[PDB]
């Protein structure tokens, strides 16, 4: 073998699809991601 | 080159028309195998 940064480990109940990875807001900045290992949807504040 | 498959299977009961739908791409399978970007019109299945 990874985008580090800042936030809190915060579970999110969004429903991805098996071909989607990232997230995008109005300003085109990531909020919602899917972990590369365990299929987890989380958010960044 | 990277041959973006997007196949779908649909149920069919019409003579000459098609339905509508709403939102962007999904590759059911996605694989970069190296083709030319010029054609797309679903291929045959016969007996």
UniProtKB/Swiss-Prot annotation, chain A:
The chain holds residues 540 to 588 of 1273 of the full protein. Binds to host ACE2. RBD also interacts with the N-linked glycan on 'Asn-90' of ACE2. Cleavage of S generates a polybasic C-terminal sequence on S1 that binds to host Neuropilin-1 (NRP1) and Neuropilin-2 (NRP2) receptors. Interacts with host integrin alpha-5/beta-1 (ITGA5:ITGB1) and with ACE2 in complex with integrin alpha-5/beta-1 (ITGA5:ITGB1). May interact via cytoplasmic c-terminus with M protein. May interact (via N-terminus) with host bilirubin and biliverdin, thereby preventing antibody binding to the SARS-CoV-2 spike NTD via an allosteric mechanism. Changing residue 27 to D: In strain: Alpha/B.1.1.7. The gene is S. Attaches the virion to the cell membrane by interacting with host receptor, initiating the infection. The major receptor is host ACE2. When S2/S2' has been cleaved, binding to the receptor triggers direct fusion at the cell membrane. When S2/S2' has not been cleaved, binding to the receptor results in internalization of the virus by endocytosis using host TFRC and GRM2 and leading to fusion of the virion membrane with the host endosomal membrane. Alternatively, may use NRP1/NRP2 and integrin as entry receptors. This is Spike protein S1. It comes from Severe acute respiratory syndrome coronavirus 2 (2019-nCoV).
From Swiss-Prot, chain B:
Changing residue 36 to Q: Increased resistance to neutralizing antibodies. Changing residue 24 to V: In strain: 20A.EU1. Changing residue 17 to G: In strain: Beta/B.1.351. Changing residue 12 to V: In strain: Omicron/BA.2.75. Glycans are attached at residue 36. Changing residue 15 to E: In strain: Omicron/XBB.1.5, Omicron/EG.5.1. Changing residue 15 to G: In strain: Omicron/BA.2, Omicron/BA.2.12.1, Omicron/BA.2.75, Omicron/BA.4, Omicron/BA.5, Omicron/BQ.1.1. Binds to host ACE2. RBD also interacts with the N-linked glycan on 'Asn-90' of ACE2. Cleavage of S generates a polybasic C-terminal sequence on S1 that binds to host Neuropilin-1 (NRP1) and Neuropilin-2 (NRP2) receptors. Interacts with host integrin alpha-5/beta-1 (ITGA5:ITGB1) and with ACE2 in complex with integrin alpha-5/beta-1 (ITGA5:ITGB1). May interact via cytoplasmic c-terminus with M protein. May interact (via N-terminus) with host bilirubin and biliverdin, thereby preventing antibody binding to the SARS-CoV-2 spike NTD via an allosteric mechanism. Attaches the virion to the cell membrane by interacting with host receptor, initiating the infection. The major receptor is host ACE2. When S2/S2' has been cleaved, binding to the receptor triggers direct fusion at the cell membrane. When S2/S2' has not been cleaved, binding to the receptor results in internalization of the virus by endocytosis using host TFRC and GRM2 and leading to fusion of the virion membrane with the host endosomal membrane. Alternatively, may use NRP1/NRP2 and integrin as entry receptors. This is Spike protein S1. It comes from Severe acute respiratory syndrome coronavirus 2. The chain holds residues 199 to 245 of 1273 of the full protein.
